[PDB]
Amino acid sequence: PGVTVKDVNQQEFVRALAAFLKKSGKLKVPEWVDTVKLAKHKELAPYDENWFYTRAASTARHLYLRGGAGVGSMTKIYGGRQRNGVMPSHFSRGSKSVARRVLQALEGLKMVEKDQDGGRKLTPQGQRDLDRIAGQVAAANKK
Amino acid sequence: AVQISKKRKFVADGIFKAELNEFLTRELAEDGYSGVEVRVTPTRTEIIILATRTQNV
Amino acid sequence: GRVRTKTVKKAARVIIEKYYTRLGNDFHTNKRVCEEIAIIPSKKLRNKIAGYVTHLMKRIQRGPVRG
Amino acid sequence: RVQPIKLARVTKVLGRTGSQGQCTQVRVEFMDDTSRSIIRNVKGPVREGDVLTLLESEREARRL
Amino acid sequence: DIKLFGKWSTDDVQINDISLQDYIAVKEKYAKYLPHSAGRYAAKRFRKAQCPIVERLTNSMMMHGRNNGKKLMTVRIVKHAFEIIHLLTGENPLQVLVNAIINSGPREDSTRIGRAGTVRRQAVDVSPLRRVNQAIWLLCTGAREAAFRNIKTIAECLADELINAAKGSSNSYAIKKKDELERVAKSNR
Amino acid sequence: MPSKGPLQSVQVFGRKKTATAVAHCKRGNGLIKVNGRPLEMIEPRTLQYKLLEPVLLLGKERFAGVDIRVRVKGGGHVAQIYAIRQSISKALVAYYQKYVDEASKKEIKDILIQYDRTLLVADPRRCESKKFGGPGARARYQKSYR
Amino acid sequence: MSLVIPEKFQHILRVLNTNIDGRRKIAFAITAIKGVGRRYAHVVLRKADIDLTKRAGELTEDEVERVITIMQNPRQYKIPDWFLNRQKDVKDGKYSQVLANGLDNKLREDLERLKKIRAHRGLRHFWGLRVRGQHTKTTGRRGRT
Amino acid sequence: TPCGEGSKTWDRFQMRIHKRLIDLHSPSEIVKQITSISIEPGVEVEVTIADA
Amino acid sequence: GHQQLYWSHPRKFGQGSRSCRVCSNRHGLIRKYGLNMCRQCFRQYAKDIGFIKLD
Amino acid sequence: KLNNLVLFDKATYDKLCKEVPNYKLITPAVVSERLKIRGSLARAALQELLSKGLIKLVSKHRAQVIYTRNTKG
RNA sequence: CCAACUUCUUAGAGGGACAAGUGGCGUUCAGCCACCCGAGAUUGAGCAAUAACAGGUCUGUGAUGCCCUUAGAUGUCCGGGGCUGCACGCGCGCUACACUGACUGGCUCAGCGUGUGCCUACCCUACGCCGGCAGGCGCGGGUAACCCGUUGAACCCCAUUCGUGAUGGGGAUCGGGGAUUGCAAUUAUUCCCCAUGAACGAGGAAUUCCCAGUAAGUGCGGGUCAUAAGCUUGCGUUGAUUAAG
Ligand SMILES: [Mg+2]
Ligand SMILES: [Mg+2]
């Protein structure tokens, strides 16, 4: 029936919306996309070659649950554990200009707007079709 | 001008209190000192000595 | 670790020697009597006295204790 | 020579022994009559009234 | 009737030895859905015996520091291993687990702080909780030391050592070494 | 629309170590979810049978007149599922002492006590602070002699 | 997809002066080249328009030639400037990745440069000491006898 | 310890300061005599500006 | 002398410019909450500030 | 006691598709020591034998994928 | 008043547990061992006697005796260097020896606490825009349950790659470059990038600490702090194997 995003498995809701944005080729992908390493707490490049679409799908969904997320906030949520070699490991921040470029690229896709205060929310046009494909992926849980 | 945090409000007047305790010890030791007691108002503040020989102060 | 120190036993004996006509083998009434009739500085030794008071209720209802 | 590996219920535990507090004397009874009862020792904790099985039944008790 | 990990109910299982029914807890009073609980088992003694044996097997599996509190990570070691066990045999895996507890728990060992004849000298019997403690210790250890340098998963190495120990062939580590406890106990009987 | 029976409901918490979780439950028709999302759509999923567990040995269809929903705050990934396991257990126990007979409440408390009492007792053990000479509360730094 | 094998499969390849292993995959097979690290290898391959999951002995010689060509002069294949070994080289002012005996050439060349003008770094390379200001009182014992 | 010698002991000083908050819709003149009821050394009172 | 470079090494940042406000040492001092007293005899006045220990 | 082989010959691949869908426990760790391959083609080829339909899938976990023999009679 | 209330949160008061109740033991003494009820049937720490030690500290102190030195001064300031030098020996520790793992990506959970200064310059950081990264600017907020901050912490969970190979384990050593703090970075402050890729396969004699939210894993925050934690002092998280002698 009426199935929102919250009652769907969301590890593979991200796989659903990444495949959506990849086939709807209206996302302003940067030129440096294949040499990025993604947030210096890790030592290899990202394995998936079209990783920019699954980061975009993820950062739209986290922006759905949390309004007013900025480029400083998105790097605190994709950060992880930096292994410092012979010294103990620590938390470290994400990559800022992969977070800034992906929020600007979604604004070309008309799925994120700025706020009265700082940060970003997503427009009603933005939420209406990730609810539309949330219904598809809960139906494809059967299908 | 601008005022400072409540956490360092309380350690500043506690260290105000400890400083003039030490000086009024060094002055009034020969005159039966026995401590002090402070009251701060948004006016004149009033510090009463607790001297035993109130003649000599 | 239950063993009760001398101030618990001594002060409970002076209740039962002196206010036996007000006490009984209920803990929660003797706790209220000893609160009203003694001067107890904290709550923990209050009901640690009152428990030894109820112990001696079943003890001196049997025979001649130091009574 | 060939013994049946015979099981036995315990009566009263006779306190620790074994110079480190490791062995417990237990006084087993051989499940078939309560008249036949040897005093023996196990290691590990006992719980009076349970069942333990002797690989060989009669060797020795703790006496000098 | 309760189906530990969703299946493999616990009525067909039978503990064969009389000596261990009061210490192995497969029955309905101590049968759960999955082995993870707020324990409180070493507060007073002798309540690590009505702790169910699937819980006591998944506690004795995370051992060596790098896996020391990973209890949501060793519960799936046992979750998968029951399915590997069920396919090589066709039996309820709880029945073949308690056959491993029966057959890997020793019956004799020895104790001495003096003049090591071999290591310990005076051969003693064993209580039926220490043979349960040494059943779960030998089984989890042998499943670990035979999967340390191997392509083989810990789940398969667990599964194929206690179905190898429930039959009894001295090919599992819990049998080929428990006999050496009972050999060395006869050697200083 | 408040036209029938305004606020026939309770709001009942359960805890583990910091993790509080308070279940608001109304009168309605068979709905169970936590922070918005359903109970079968829950994060760990290795502990799946011990957070839909009061539903199991009581009954989905029998106890389907209630619309339990929970908000969770604080804790960890394991403590936040013991907190909701405690919460929705003692929610409909507390819902029955307020709107139906306690003959029925004792009829379900009979299930939820002989089956591992921790569904409606708060497990009292807590953080137990560090001391000033060791790496933790009990353990100590390595003593050397020579 | 390789259910058996195609017809030719190099036991070892031969790239610059290194015979890289033939049973590895290309992302980790060309890291036997001194100068191609674990990170530079993936970037050259993504500029080489290849599938990363192919193994080593099953690249045709056009694939091998184009992989060697891109890692040889990466400055024109849109690989950015602070990804390279010799950023702003101290003899020429240019930018190069160095991948060969030329890596060890330019390694010792700066060692003998500092040894010539007797800088403090060059004197401790001329000795057997630590260079980056490490302590020496208790560590590094098994370099000296 | 004043020196380095000893058996690694630590003293944990602490100060727990309490604070409470009260609102009034009073006319802002009589707050002066509200301030003028008791000297009371251990407290610290503060009156908000009357401009809301 | 010759005032241009008497006290010319910059006492700014660094422990050569922090000092005890009672007791005039530069070592061990506690700059937390603006106390700026020495470690060794913060413990003297710790009750005069009002810092009780646990009891 | 050392190096195995990737990329099957003819001699092990026909040995694969004649008896590896027959026995009951089948896992990439099994056929990377009963055969002479090393693994990661154990994972690759046994994935596509599930794609054919010669075996059944049971578990599918990231640390452990477990298959079984297929319905016989 | 274009709503009520305190469950959750924060306190304040008061309550509550006493070995009370029930068996069993014991001189039917002190008490002990079991249960039932209950949140709890020993929470954890602080203070801590008498008498001492030739224990440590005059390098913490305008605590101080005595001796020494006092202008070519052991006072004090400025500049440079040193306390980091290495055939070796010992003690705390950190990271490891992998597949119960490392990757790459998804996914979801905290608590203790700290913040712009009288001298004293410099604080915590939202957001936006430049940068591949550390970072750089513009623009706010916060003297704090008002802002950072619903502190989207790691481990763990889910998929991907890797396959027992000193390997994609381990990351020492070392070259070149890039930023920040600063009066100044050389004998590398720290951080970033690329490359280099050493021992190390679970450790002899011996030895340490610990019995429940404990050990251990795992991060976070105070202290030091212009720049800075492999240390220390706290905090939560995951959570036990053995024992009641
Ligand atoms: Mg001094
Ligand atoms: Mg391995």
Kindly provide the b/e burial profile for residues A60-95, where b requires at least 16 CB atoms within 10 angstroms of the residue's own CB.
bbebbeeeebbbebbbeebbeebeeeeeeeeeebbb
Q: Where along chain I do its domains lie?
A: 1-55
CB E38 within 8 A of CB E59: no
Question: For chain K, which bases have at least one atom within 7 A of a protein Cβ?
Answer: 7-9, 11-12, 15-21, 29-32, 34-35, 39-40, 42-47, 55-57, 60-61, 63, 77-79, 84-101, 103-111, 114-122, 125-135, 143-145, 149-150, 152-165, 168, 170-178, 182-184, 186-189, 191-197, 199, 202, 207-220, 222-227, 229-245
- CB within 8 Å: F49 and E40: no
Classify the C-alpha dihedral E91-E92-E96-E99 as positive or negative: negative
Classify the C-alpha dihedral C47-C49-C52-C53 as positive or negative: negative
Q: Indicate the SS3 state at residue E31.
A: coil
Q: How far is CA C52 from the centre of its chain?
A: 5
User: Which residues of H fall within a CB distance of 8 Å from I38?
Assistant: none
Q: Indicate the SS3 state at residue G131.
A: coil
Distance separating alpha carbons of residues C67 and D24, to the nearest angstrom: 46
Query: J51 φ, ψ to 5°?
Result: -75, -30
Which residue in C65, C52, C54 sits closest to C11, CA to CA?
C52
Domain that holds residue E101: 1-189
DSSP annotation of J37? B
Q: How was this structure determined?
A: cryo-EM
Distance separating alpha carbons of residues J28 and J45, to the nearest angstrom: 9
Number of domains, chain A:
1
How many other C-beta atoms can be found within 10 angstroms of the C-beta atom of residue F104? 12
Number of domains, chain D:
1
Which residue in A123, A18, A111, A120 sits closest to A72, CA to CA?
A120
In sequence order, the β-bridge partners of residue E12 are: none
Fold classification of F8-146 (topology level): Ribosomal Protein S5; domain 2 (3.30.230)
User: Which residues of I fall within a CB distance of 8 Å from B12?
Assistant: 34
- Does the annotation list I9 as a binding residue? no
Residues 6+ positions from A114 with CB-CB distance below 8 Å: A120, A121
Domain that holds residue A30: 1-143
Distance separating alpha carbons of residues J57 and J67, to the nearest angstrom: 5
> What are the residue ranges of helices labelled H in J5-63?
10-19, 42-52
H6 touches F: beta carbon within 8 Å: no
CB H5 within 8 A of CB I40: no
Which residue in F78, F76, F91 sits closest to F14, CA to CA?
F91
Residue A12 to chain G, least CA–CA distance (Å): 23
In what order do the strands lie in the sheet containing F69-73?
F10-16, F19-25, F69-73, F33-34, F37-38
Distance separating alpha carbons of residues I1 and G55, to the nearest angstrom: 78
Q: Which chains touch H (3 or more CB pairs under 8 A)?
A: B, F, I
Residues 6+ positions from B25 with CB-CB distance below 8 Å: B33
**Between the CA of residue B38 and those of B7, B15, F59, H39, what are the distances in Å?**
19, 12, 70, 11
- A-G Cβ pairs (cutoff 8 Å, strict): 21
Number of domains, chain E:
1
The most distant pair of C-alpha atoms in chain D lies apart, rounded to whole Å, by: 34
**Sequence letter at residue D54:** L
Residue A74 to chain F, least CA–CA distance (Å): 21
- Does the annotation list I12 as a binding residue? no
Helix (H) or strand (E) holding A92: strand A90-92
Which residue in A123, A132, A135, A139 sits closest to A60, CA to CA?
A123
Burial class of residue A142 in the structure, from the number of CB atoms within 10 Å of its CB (0-12 exposed, 13-18 middle, 19+ buried): exposed
- CB within 8 Å: F49 and E72: no
Fold classification of I1-55 (topology level): 30s Ribosomal Protein S14; Chain N (4.10.830)
**Nearest residue on chain E to F123, alpha-carbon basis:** E38
